[PDB]
């Protein structure tokens, strides 16, 4: 027992499958988005209560908290817009159009220092996600686009983005299975490699930033050497219910969700990793020698597939979010022993 479970509550205000659920930078608020475009903002400590609720007219694909004003939330649409939402005032501060042919704002990342954000903007899916896309750098003070990064060999949909701790690096994963690491001072690709067969779904820097972790359509979780391009440190085949596609099956009818939100999350020091499963979050210890990753804690509590997760620590206490296709979000409190 490397953690103690202080409890597990349920936030049940969403009536459709969850797309995203992220804890804010203060560690006090959750922003969750379902597939019907409903955005909810809610606290949970010490009880669950809803601070804001709204139906988007436009489809919403992405969500990201601002780093230097806890209350601000970036939202990316399926109609080529990024909107800044004030969760305190409960109104949009602005909405910027992407003057382009790329309506799907698949990913948003706010820089740690608060001065910039990036978004990915992709062409429509094919009647596959092997479609063009762009990666945009913005200035947060003006909320204007500053530049877009060229993608090698071709424009491609970027699914996931993450900054390192200082913000000088940005790691991305794309629909072509390639990870691209950007130097955000020189505005160039410092490094790229083929990571997965099929799409990359999530990317993250290790706590120490000597590696990046990725998870992709081939069901692999891989850890890469950040100093040597494409060199693996470790590799695991996760259970297929870690990567989906996620299926909720009356008869005849089924719902199918491909990974869109964060598939993995980490404790504050990057020693443990939360993943999706059919019945709840499954936590692994990182850094082990074992050739097969063994589950060290199963949070359970779900009656439908978990499709996205988060893990936040504040006041020296961990909060795990697990979100499922029935729209339920379990919030599990963990203290480290």
Ligand X SMILES: O=C(N[C@@H]1CCCS(=O)(=O)c2ccccc21)c1ccc2nc(O)cnc2c1
| Rg of the chain on CA atoms, in Å | 19
Q: Give min distance, CB of 77 to ligand X, in A.
A: 16
Q: Give min distance, CB of 170 to ligand X, in A.
A: 15
Q: Are 241 and 277 in contact (CB under 8 A)?
A: yes
Q: Say whether residue 68 binds ligand X (CB under 6 A).
A: yes
Q: Which runs of consecutive H residues, i.e. helices, occur in the chain?
A: none
Taking CB under 6 A as the criterion, the residue among 110, 162, 179, 323 binding ligand X is 110
**What's the rounded Cα separation, in Å, for the pair 313 and 320?**
9
Strands 282-285 and 295-298: antiparallel
- Spatial neighbors of 216 by CB under 8 A, at least 6 apart, are 173, 177, 195, 196, 197, 198, 199, 200, 201, 222, 243
Q: Give min distance, CB of 321 to ligand X, in A.
A: 22
Q: How many CA atoms lie within 13 A of 240 on its CB side?
A: 3
Two tokens at 17?
């499958």
Two tokens at 172?
């991305």
Q: Say whether residue 141 binds ligand X (CB under 6 A).
A: yes
Q: Give min distance, CB of 112 to ligand X, in A.
A: 10
Q: Are 63 and 76 in contact (CB under 8 A)?
A: yes
Taking CB under 6 A as the criterion, the residue among 4, 6, 89, 94 binding ligand X is 94
Count helices and strands in the chain by DSSP H and E runs: 0, 30
Two tokens at 289?
């020698």
Q: Which of residues 74-93 bind ligand X (CB under 6 A)?
A: 74, 84, 93
- Which span (42-50, 120-128, 136-144, 218-226) binds ligand X, by CB under 6 A? 136-144
Q: Say whether residue 66 binds ligand X (CB under 6 A).
A: yes
Give the nearer residue to ligand X in terms of CB position, either 111 or 214.
111
Burial zone of 202 (CB within 10 Å; 0-12 exposed, 13-18 middle, 19+ buried) = buried
Taking CB under 6 A as the criterion, the residue among 17, 32, 62, 67 binding ligand X is 67
Q: Say whether residue 143 binds ligand X (CB under 6 A).
A: yes
Q: Which of residues 279-318 bind ligand X (CB under 6 A)?
A: none
**What's the rounded Cα separation, in Å, for the pair 305 and 288?**
27
Give the nearer residue to ligand X in terms of CB position, either 67 or 275.
67
- Which span (137-145, 208-216, 271-279, 284-292) binds ligand X, by CB under 6 A? 137-145
User: Using CA of residue 185, residue 191, residue 196, residue 197, what is the dihedral sign?
Assistant: positive
Q: Give min distance, CB of 115 to ligand X, in A.
A: 7
Q: Give min distance, CB of 331 to ligand X, in A.
A: 25
Taking CB under 6 A as the criterion, the residue among 120, 140, 161, 243 binding ligand X is 140
Q: Say whether residue 136 binds ligand X (CB under 6 A).
A: no
Taking CB under 6 A as the criterion, the residue among 42, 117, 163, 224 binding ligand X is 117
Taking CB under 6 A as the criterion, the residue among 8, 9, 59, 69 binding ligand X is 69
Give the nearer residue to ligand X in terms of CB position, either 98 or 273.
98
Q: Say whether residue 71 binds ligand X (CB under 6 A).
A: no
- Spatial neighbors of 62 by CB under 8 A, at least 6 apart, are 20, 74, 75, 76, 105, 106, 107, 108, 119
- Interface ranges with ligand X (CB under 6 A): 66-69, 72, 74, 84, 93-94, 110, 114, 117, 140-143
């Amino acid at each position: 027992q490397p953690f103690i479970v202080l409890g597990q509550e349920e936030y049940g205000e969403h009536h459709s499958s969850i797309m995203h659920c992220r804890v804010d930078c203060s560690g006090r608020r959750v922003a969750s988005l379902d597939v019907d475009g409903v955005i909810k903002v809610w606290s949970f400590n010490p009880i669950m209560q809803t601070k804001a609720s709204s139906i988007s007219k436009s489809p919403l694909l992405s969500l990201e908290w601002a780093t230097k004003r806890d209350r601000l939330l970036l939202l990316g649409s399926g109609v080529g817009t990024v909107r800044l939402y004030d969760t305190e005032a409960k109104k949009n501060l602005c909405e910027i159009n992407i003057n382009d042919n790329m309506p799907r704002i698949l990913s948003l990342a706010c820089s740690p220092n608060g001065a910039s954000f990036v978004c990915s903007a992709a062409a429509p899916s094919l009647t596959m996600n092997q479609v063009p896309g762009r990666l945009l750098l913005w200035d947060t003070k003006t909320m204007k686009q500053q530049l877009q990064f060229s993608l090698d060999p071709e424009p491609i949909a970027i699914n996931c983005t993450a900054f390192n701790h200082n913000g000088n690096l940005l790691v991305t994963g794309a629909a072509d299975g390639v990870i691209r690491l950007f130097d955000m001072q020189q505005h160039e690709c410092a490094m790229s490699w083929r990571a997965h067969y099929g799409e990359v779904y999530s990317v993250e820097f290790s706590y120490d930033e000597n590696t990046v972790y990725s998870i992709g359509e081939d069901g692999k979780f891989i850890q890469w050497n950040i100093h040597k391009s494409g060199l693996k440190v470790s590799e695991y085949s996760l259970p297929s219910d870690a990567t989906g596609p996620f299926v909720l099956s009356y008869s005849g009818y089924k719902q199918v969700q491909v990974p869109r939100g964060r598939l993995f999350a980490f404790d504050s020091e990057g020693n443990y990793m939360l993943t999706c499963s059919a019945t709840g979050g499954v936590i692994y210890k990182l850094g082990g020698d074992e050739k097969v990753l063994e589950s060290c804690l199963s949070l359970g509590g779900h009656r439908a597939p978990v499709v996205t997760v988060d893990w936040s620590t504040a006041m020296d206490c961990g909060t795990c979010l697990t979100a499922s296709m029935d729209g339920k979000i379990k919030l599990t409190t963990l203290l480290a022993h």
